[PDB]
Amino acid sequence: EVSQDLFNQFNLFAQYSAAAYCGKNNDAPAGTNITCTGNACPEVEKADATFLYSFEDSGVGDVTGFLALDNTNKLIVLSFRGSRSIENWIGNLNFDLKEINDICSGCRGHDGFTSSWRSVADTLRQKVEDAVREHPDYRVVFTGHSLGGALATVAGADLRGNGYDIDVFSYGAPRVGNRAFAEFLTVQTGGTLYRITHTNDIVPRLPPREFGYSHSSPEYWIKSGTLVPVTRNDIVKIEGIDATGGNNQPNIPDIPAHLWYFGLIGTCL
Amino acid sequence: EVSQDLFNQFNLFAQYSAAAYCGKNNDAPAGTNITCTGNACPEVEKADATFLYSFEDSGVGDVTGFLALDNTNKLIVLSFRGSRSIENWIGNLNFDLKEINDICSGCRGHDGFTSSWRSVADTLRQKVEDAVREHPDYRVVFTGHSLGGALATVAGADLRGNGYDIDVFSYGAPRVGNRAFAEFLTVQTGGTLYRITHTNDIVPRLPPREFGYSHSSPEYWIKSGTLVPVTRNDIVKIEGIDATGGNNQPNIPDIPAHLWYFGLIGTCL
Ligand SMILES: *[C@@H]1O[C@H](CO)[C@@H](O)[C@H](O)[C@H]1NC(C)=O
Ligand SMILES: *[C@@H]1O[C@H](CO)[C@@H](O)[C@H](O)[C@H]1NC(C)=O
16 A cells, blocks of 8 residues: 555656657657557646657667656656567666766666666756756656666666755666665655566566665555556555565566556557 | 446457467467466456367468367357457458358458458368367357457358357457348347447448448447446447447547457457
């Protein structure tokens, strides 16, 4: 169980995350209304939500996503898309750690996620700063599914401490580095990280703890099944760095579970 | 607002239809438990249901499907897979009629559907007749979604009146031939056709009336949205050959509404 208000937020950013895949913004001019194909993001459509900036295959890591202004909910949202071919991305995923002392001390992060962020960091930092100046009253939220969740998470840890809170909602995000990072993300100030997982979704189980990785705490574990609707009553907050008994069980994992976070995500009907 | 019992039947056969895509059918041993990936068919898994016979790319139209035995619900089910790539299949759909007096005099059917069925009929009847003999008390049901729905309806009309009722539950089915064929599907005894539709699904609107097609009556039209769970109250029975105000309405159609009959269908997570 989690609060209704938290549940509403989890649903909304799952949709903002779903929109990184299913919205029609390839080269949508800034100012367009955010809309999605196949009932992907109805809450988002319902808000006065427009694009601030849309990016695609950006930088070294082919980072894709968008920055949005939502006047209804008073948000600045930076949404990272995950892989366009998830199963592949999963089997092609290396486990290499890299030092990331310039974000936290003795921190080691995943090499590909930290790099891809690093390469787009300055352009996007700038773009959040602008929006924040233009709407000082709005909450800044970073969000993402899968790879997008990892990115989001790395970018929040990176850009916090600069005079505006950054909240992060990740959905099915992989592990992003070492126990020291997990600790940094557990305790850091200047915002909250909400790490959402589903059932036996495989992706938050990777890269393995046996490659030196750990999970930040806490974890919001969706227990309800794939293609089942989520209620506030189906989400358990799991406390403890690499707590087990949430998604971190030694049972057998699943890919489909990864594509159902409140609604269909990481794929478009 | 259809009955609870009818709703349960609707949901079950949607899943048997979904199972045609997401099962691990291929050709797996006869007498194997039927299971699907991605929670595509939990009600079927819950049944004591097994394959009797699976076909892949059989005959003229590469017909794909399975025949199943369901000892829990007392059914013999012939379920036909739709296309592997529905968007391409719709773009390539041919509108030609070919005569089918041997089904019903005056009748013209879609040429590709009728020819694909014609080409596997003998084998499939023999398989069905065999199962009827072994379980003479079980209800025979043909089912399918999309092109599968077409094949189930045709096989139906062709194979009824040989001593055993055949019910047909079809999900987002295209039209299957001329007004004469439509009429005949509307009246024929020894089994009931339940032709189910969703919102603005594109496939029940093809081929168009203009090319000389009609829809049998009645029509069960799910009005709840894509990715929204269906209740009894979201289904409306619609009377009259070529009646308008269920799926057959003058608005823009949608491919995603085609992929959501009670649950995900025509695609596999
Ligand atoms: C965009 O959204 C606003 C407010 O949410 C709306 O009133 C406006 O008409 C929309 N534009 C289009 C093209 O629909
Ligand atoms: C198939 O499911 C039935 C119950 O519906 C069960 O008794 C049987 O053992 C299962 N078979 C396998 C191989 O899992």
